[PDB]
Design an enzyme around this catalytic site. Structure first.
Site, short mmCIF file in Angstrom:
data_model
loop_
_atom_site.label_atom_id
_atom_site.label_comp_id
_atom_site.label_asym_id
_atom_site.label_seq_id
_atom_site.Cartn_x
_atom_site.Cartn_y
_atom_site.Cartn_z
CD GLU A 1 -3.15 0.83 2.17
OE1 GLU A 1 -2.59 0.00 3.20
OE2 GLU A 1 -4.17 1.32 2.00
CB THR B 1 1.07 -6.20 3.90
OG1 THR B 1 0.26 -5.78 2.99
CG2 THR B 1 2.58 -6.03 3.33
CB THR C 1 -9.18 -3.58 13.28
OG1 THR C 1 -8.24 -4.14 12.70
CG2 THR C 1 -8.77 -2.85 14.40
CD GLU D 1 25.56 -13.25 26.16
OE1 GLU D 1 24.89 -12.73 26.94
OE2 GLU D 1 26.76 -13.15 26.00
#
Ligand code: GTP
Ligand code: GTP
Ligand code: GDP
Ligand code: GDP
Ligand code: MG
Ligand code: MG
EC number: 3.6.5.-
Lengths: 440, 431, 88, 431, 430
Positions: free
Chosen positions: A71, A145, A179, A254
């Protein structure tokens, strides 16, 4: 030399990264034009900027980053922002049309064209870097995406750069707020790609950070801009050991060798101990013993899961600021004794302690106030299996009626590999139960 | 002219060595620049034991600092008393093992173990009459533990008639820094028994308990802990550097302490540790140093020495002292509690007196102890090692770089052997 | 807040949009860093003072150490003094 | 009073020799103008071996400069220390060889070799007693490798009783400067095995590693490389120009370094090399120079000296030093490394002491090594030659200048005969 | 003294020379009126008092492009009698520029070549600038290069030929004129460097981010390569090369003399500050197929020999470390019979940027000329297009009318096929 490549795939990655690169310029003294002013403070040509920035020419610093999203509307937002001059224009990779919340579009049809250009600049940044230590992936698996183009880039990176760690930070759908409707489809299929490719994966969730910002910063209306601001503090304190010297430096390798007991269980929570406003900071007496108790509070994790159901397997505590080593060991002693949190039986020594010396920064205008100390807890647990379980239930409910499948099927995807991620996710449900089970 | 080679490995080893060379420096009175500025003629008499002559009166230490990550080496280089070292002796790597024994010993070891033996061989050939090697590292880590066990292994094959003093810290029961401390220690102990000659076990919360109760330090940093480590290490070499009434080299302490080749794990302590508010109340006498010497609270090891018997104990007194109250009090402490000493080794306590005390202190002592109470530590490390190995957790790396699980199955084989060795030595009695 | 639609769309960028991110000029001060070293980094060939004697005289005008924060770092590490057991 | 005629050929010869006269003029104390300004009597005592007295006390170097392209001559003349050379010695062509051995040796060389020997014979007749001819050039080029090796044939014909010192820069394994390196190198070596009395093999790849690993120069130019090459050339003629406790001129070296007439290729190395980061920490002493000159990294040839036995070695020590430390250190390196030295020659090391160290260092040493390991660089060039010769590629530029293909075969046969004798003497053992 | 003579034939020849001589004036500080306010001797000749005249001729049958130079900003720079014009152009006909209209105008061309050669003391070589697609560039260029071989032997002639592409074509009879010129440039020119139009178009839109490049933008960066490879004669440097350096380091066989070009740090002004132009960064970018001035895939073939012209603040160390990584890279393949495939030369002057030019000021530059077996794909593409068009004998009556024989089309095709057979035999391993 220590340096990391930070990549941002999707709309959530760019906005989090633009808040992340907002914080990194303030710590290292980089102005928005890309030039460190020597006259601002006392300080010489240190290598602390070399972790995320590369000195180019004379007095110019460019980030070791790429911004990619299909986008165009989020990548031109950075192109016209406060950091236009900071980035080289090539690593703001754009596209024609978005993935439209379709995982098949990101993986197969549109994302195949853009991923070839993505590997070129990753290759160029790898030639610039002397010794690479990790990749920082900022993607959201709910969208088209971050889950689709995130899956393709992660598969190609593991082929080209073997055995180098990739610390992918992912945002999952919340059990309450969402959403989009095809979020269970995208999150399940991205779990297959995140499983065998990401070496260490840190979970995030919008609702838990919404709940943290509601109570700890006593503001009723949290926007997406304010949520990304305190996610950036988690990324900063995790990487703070490489940049600024401290009592117990912790490398990226680590982090890897101490937190994941088995190769497939690499889904970790995140916490930040002092998250306070300016008015509440004055009344609060901030001490290492108190914030460590605040770090393990059930409301302080950034993923909406209850750790009391599970058991904390391997824990890591990244400290910053004026933290003496004597009381963090006292903090470890107190947090081990009390019964309200539970460890797994086969790991008698579960904590990884890391003390840096640089105090935490605050961006002006943000809700956070300056604190002398901070804890960035990244801990593995068996309560992450509850997060996958509720996500598994919503995917299985929407798959019986075969809703929202013909969009994926026509765009390259076949029906067979929807259940392949369902089978693989179900194998992940069983693994958290059998690993956290007691041994006689 | 019996010199000692010093090698620092790991984050713990380099930080200890950075404080160690500060304690050696002001005892011999050299500045951070390197030129001599002491006020005693006896300091310069024996400087080849720890330093090398250079042009312009510069004194460069016999230190070979080495690490797989360059981050900790940067702090030591930039610190005070840190520019004295030779930059050629800073052999280093870039990739970094990262708390992995197999990475520090097999994969990243191979590219570095060829380079670190070349630096040691250049330094060891130059000096004339070698006495031993002083290596300082950790055991719970991977950068200095697995690498340090590799460097000791190759240096025994090259110099098989010389000592190795291994001042190593151990995993702790109360607080543990890293998750893989039991894995890294069990592999490291297997290589310290066969290769190293003397091992000085140090423990972190014993250092913290000393800094809380004895020294009354409110905020003890790592420098307060590392000054306590270097207090012993200056006291071990005190007879080589300074003349005394009873001269005792490393080989003198070696042959007097270990009755059998494998039982060479010691435990140390420094005697005159008093808080600043209690300096005037305390009297610095010989029986006062001895009473603090045999106290379990003053011991810098996690193991409680009341639970076991001392096979052999060593005391290294320094200062203007009378040999009456030295050895009579060693007789007195044997007669007070003979049950705490091994009966079939009569006259366990060995003492030596050095004329020159440490800087500032009128008199001091360093107390080496070869007690069988150290089995409580090796049993404890083997307890956490078997806890994780049954579930095979945190294992997929060590088997990834080519160290098979057969190396794990042989690990608690000798780890449980040596804790079975110490138990039956205590139970055995003469006649 | 805004009094008109034109003012709202004009001040979108500098208040809540892409120009709302904090600037170092907006910040009061840059924090004084606790770096590994202000000398040459250990493995960095492309450095101006790599061949030079950076620890001593040759780098005197160009190392630019920070005295207060460097002393704070040394005091936190416990490297500055050996006076803990001096007894006098 | 034993003069050396210095000849520089081509781009490589002019650039290196420009820095050769940089050191010698600074060592002998003459200014850019040419007037003597030394501070010691010893500089005037043997100034005649490299300089001729002229009007006004200006000393002009005894150097003939020859090439085919005026660009390198413009660089030498206009540069610093470039106004001392005689413009009558500035003989050069106009066409340019284009890195072609045939054009430098047959077509273009025919009309300028008669010019260059006219000045050389003038320089030889002026000086009272010749001692040798010292040429510096490359072997991968055609301007200096082609025309320079022609003069070695003719200067040996006119003066057969005088020696040849060829500082030839050989091609590199990792990099090729010219595409026709093995064609030009194998042809020039065939012209050097008979005519040149001894050879001093140099290369750039060893100079890159010396500047990086030892001198810590991350960005060296040719001026840094030529300075190290020029330090060797001043070291070879050290006993000619200055008194010493044991003098050794160019005939002294050749009688000790050449056991058989075809085995006259040597590898060189200048000993006291360190960076300013380790200048203060370094203790320069004859034992410290001994461990530096015998290292493989200090050698200025691509051949690793560990692979082959050292036939004969020569050391040219400079500075006020004890001769006992000279002999026993060369003795100790023989006994500690016996397999690396040829057994059928006892006392492989030639040692000489000069009482005048170079300016800035109180002790120095130039090492000359005749080893059978130098067949490794010959074998690589011959292997690169056979790959190009079998397809007859890049050959019509050579056979188009009047050369037959049988000169390439005889050069290759002499190349293979050279590496055969090196291998046989290494394998052969006495008794 | 190093002196070089350049000849520019055709519309493409002198338009490149307009950008070439614009760059050469800025290198030595020559003003457009010819006044300088010893290194200039290679390209300019000192005439009279303080006036410098370029050592070149602008010859073209078409007068409409020569007089633009005669009425442009360089009116006082060039000698007007050096600029040779004609009454009418060759009209994209090879027969016109070779026999009918090219015969009388080449006699005046050799007259000024002899005048220029006598004035210069030491001549290094020839630089021809032409397009084999056009009638004047192929026609007059073939006749000029044929006469220059017999008249001036042993002097190597650099060939900068603008070469056609099948993807972008500006004319229909481009395959005919390119095929017929192939016989002339094979046996006469000593070193030929191909240049393709659309590859320069693609470099502009990718590196210099120009959406609509023009012919002026192409010729400026074409002149950057030409000024870089001749820069070793003009100025001092670490490893100076010559005109005669290129002729034997890059030509293994007398018929294999075709080489490519690549200018590595071609970066716009805005992108130059962020990019760190390291020596290994541009050397890696130089061997990238995107940087080639002809559309080639060097991974299809093998590198017979490579020349690397380095400009700027480049030391001998980092040029070694850059090409050491090149040989270890798998995608860059060298041919088996040439183990020593690199030629490197280091100059001491950074490239000068034209005011108003697209290029940014860069500290260091790399111009790479390489001999590759992949050039056979370029010659074979128009080989098939010529075969289809000649089979139906279209566009032939324009040629045979102007004195051409019909039988020489097969002679050019056989010579073109002999070029193809030589490439496929040198690329074959033994
Ligand atoms: N924490 C946080 N989450 C965000 C932010 N922006 C978007 N998200 C999350 O991202 C999800 C939307 O999916 P994305 O991957 O961003 O969608 P996308 O990247 O535009 O991909 P397409 O819609 O297919 O173009 C939402 O459910 C949010 O939870 C942000 O600024 N902060
Ligand atoms: N690089 C470059 N190529 C050019 C330029 N102008 C023309 N060309 C090329 O030249 C070709 C035309 O051939 P030319 O030889 O120049 O045409 P001409 O010189 O006018 O020949 P006639 O038409 O017969 O008079 C075109 O297809 C272009 O590809 C230029 O300015 N730069
Ligand atoms: N006394 C002391 N101990 C230290 C210091 N730094 C680290 N340690 C100890 O070292 C142990 C961890 O070892 P580690 O750093 O992982 O070893 P490495 O992998 O070789 O670097 C911890 O238990 C610490 O107690 C220090 O400055 N002083
Ligand atoms: N040390 C040094 N070597 C050089 C220099 N210039 C060229 N060379 C070497 O000379 C060889 C090529 O010689 P070349 O320049 O072709 O000789 P030419 O025929 O006179 O041009 C290469 O191996 C280079 O490394 C220089 O200035 N210094
Ligand atoms: Mg989007
Ligand atoms: Mg025309």
């Amino acid at each position: 030399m220590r340096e990391v490549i930070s990549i941002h795939i999707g709309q959530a990655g760019i906005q989090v990264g633009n808040a992340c690169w907002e914080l990194y310029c303030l710590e290292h003294g980089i102005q928005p034009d890309g030039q460190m002013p020597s006259d601002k403070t006392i300080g010489g040509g240190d290598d602390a900027f070399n972790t995320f920035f590369s000195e180019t020419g004379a007095g110019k610093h460019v980030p070791r980053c790429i911004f990619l999203d299909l986008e165009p509307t989020v990548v031109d937002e950075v192109r016209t922002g406060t950091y236009r001059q900071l980035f080289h224009p090539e690593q703001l990779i754009s596209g024609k049309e978005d993935a439209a919340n379709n995982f098949a579009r990101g993986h197969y049809t549109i994302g195949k064209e853009i991923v070839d250009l993505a590997l070129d600049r990753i290759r160029k940044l790898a030639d610039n870097c002397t010794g690479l230590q990790g990749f920082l992936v900022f993607n959201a698996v709910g969208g088209g995406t971050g889950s689709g183009l995130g899956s393709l880039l992660l598969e190609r990176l593991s082929v080209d750069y073997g055995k180098k760690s990739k610390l992918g930070f992912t945002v999952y759908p919340s059990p309450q707020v969402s959403t989009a409707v095809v979020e269970p489809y995208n999150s399940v299929l991205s779990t297959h790609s995140l499983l065998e490719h990401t070496d260490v994966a840190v979970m995030l969730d919008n609702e838990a950070i919404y709940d943290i910002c509601r109570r700890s910063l006593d503001i009723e209306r949290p926007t997406y801009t304010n949520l990304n601001r305190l996610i950036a503090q988690v990324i900063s304190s995790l990487t703070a050991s490489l940049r600024f010297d401290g009592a117990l430096n912790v490398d990226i390798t680590e982090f890897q060798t101490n937190l994941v007991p088995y190769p497939r269980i690499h889904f970790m929570l995140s916490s930040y101990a002092p998250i306070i406003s300016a008015e509440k900071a004055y009344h609060e007496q901030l001490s290492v013993a108190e914030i460590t108790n605040a770090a393990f509070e059930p409301a302080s994790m950034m993923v909406k899961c209850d750790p009391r159901h599970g058991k904390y397997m391997a824990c890591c505590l990244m400290y910053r600021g004026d933290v003496v080593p004597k009381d963090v060991n006292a903090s470890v002693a107190t947090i081990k004794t009390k019964r309200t949190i539970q460890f797994v039986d086969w790991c008698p020594t579960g904590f990884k302690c890391g003390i840096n010396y640089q105090p935490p920064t605050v961006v002006p205008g943000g809700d956070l106030a300056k604190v002398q100390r901070a804890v960035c807890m990244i801990s593995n647990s068996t309560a992450i299996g509850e997060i996958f379980s509720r996500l598994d239930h919503k995917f299985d409910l929407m798959y019986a009626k075969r809703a929202f499948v013909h969009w994926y099927v026509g765009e390259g995807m076949e029906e067979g590999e929807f259940s392949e991620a369902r089978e693989d996710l179900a194998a992940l449900e069983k693994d958290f139960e059998e690993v956290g089970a007691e041994s006689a | 002219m019996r010199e000692i080679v010093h090698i620092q490995g790991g984050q713990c080893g380099n930080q200890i060595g950075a404080k160690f060379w500060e304690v050696v420096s002001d005892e011999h009175g050299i500045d951070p620049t390197g030129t001599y500025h002491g006020d005693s003629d006896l300091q310069l008499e024996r400087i080849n034991v720890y330093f090398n002559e250079a042009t312009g009166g510069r004194y460069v230490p016999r230190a070979i600092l080495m690490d797989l990550e360059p981050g900790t080496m940067d702090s030591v280089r930039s610190g005070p008393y840190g520019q004295i070292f030779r930059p050629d002796n800073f052999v280093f790597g870039q990739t970094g093992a990262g708390n992995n024994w197999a990475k520090g010993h097999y994969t990243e070891g191979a590219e570095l173990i060829d380079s670190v033996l070349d630096v040691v061989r250049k330094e060891a050939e130059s000096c004339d009459c070698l006495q031993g090697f002083q290596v300082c590292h950790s055991l719970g880590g991977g950068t200095g533990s697995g690498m340090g066990t590799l460097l000791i292994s190759k240096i025994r094959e090259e110099y098989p008639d010389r000592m190795m003093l291994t001042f190593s810290v151990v995993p702790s029961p109360k607080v543990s820094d890293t998750v893989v401390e039991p894995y890294n220690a069990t592999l490291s102990v297997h290589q310290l028994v066969e290769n190293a000659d003397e091992c000085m076990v140090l423990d972190n919360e014993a250092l913290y308990d000393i800094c809380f109760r004895t020294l009354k330090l409110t905020t003890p940093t790592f420098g307060d802990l590392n000054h306590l480590i270097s207090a012993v290490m200056s006291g071990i070499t005190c007879c080589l550097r300074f003349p005394g009434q009873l001269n005792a080299d490393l080989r003198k302490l070696a042959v007097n302490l270990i009755p059998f080749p494998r039982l060479h794990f010691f435990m140390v302590g420094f005697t005159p540790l008093t808080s600043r508010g209690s300096q005037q109340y305390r009297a610095l006498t010989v029986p006062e140093l001895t009473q603090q010497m045999w106290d379990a609270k003053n011991m810098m090891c996690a193991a409680d020495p009341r639970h076991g018997r001392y096979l052999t104990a060593s005391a290294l007194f320094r200062g203007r002292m009378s040999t009456k109250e030295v050895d009579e009090q060693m007789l007195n402490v044997q007669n007070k509690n003979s049950s705490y000493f091994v009966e079939w080794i009569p006259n366990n306590v060995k003492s030596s007196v050095c004329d020159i005390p440490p800087k500032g202190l009128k008199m001091s002592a360093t107390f080496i102890g070869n007690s069988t109470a150290i089995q409580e530590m090796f049993k404890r490390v083997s307890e956490q090692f078997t806890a994780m190995f049954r579930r095979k957790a945190f294992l997929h790396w060590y088997t990834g770089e080519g160290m098979d699980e057969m190396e794990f199955t042989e690990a608690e084989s000798n780890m449980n052997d040596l804790v079975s060795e110490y138990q039956q030595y205590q139970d055995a009695s003469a006649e | 807040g805004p009094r008109s639609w034109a003012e709202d769309c004009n001040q979108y960028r500098t208040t809540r949009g892409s120009k709302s991110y904090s600037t170092l000029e907006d910040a009061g001060r840059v924090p004084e860093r606790y770096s590994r070293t202000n000398y040459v980094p250990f493995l960095a060939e492309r450095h101006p003072l790599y061949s030079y004697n950076d620890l001593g005289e040759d780098g005197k005008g160009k190392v630019r150490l920070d005295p207060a924060t460097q002393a704070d770092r040394f005091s936190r590490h416990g490297w500055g003094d050996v006076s803990l057991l001096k007894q006098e």
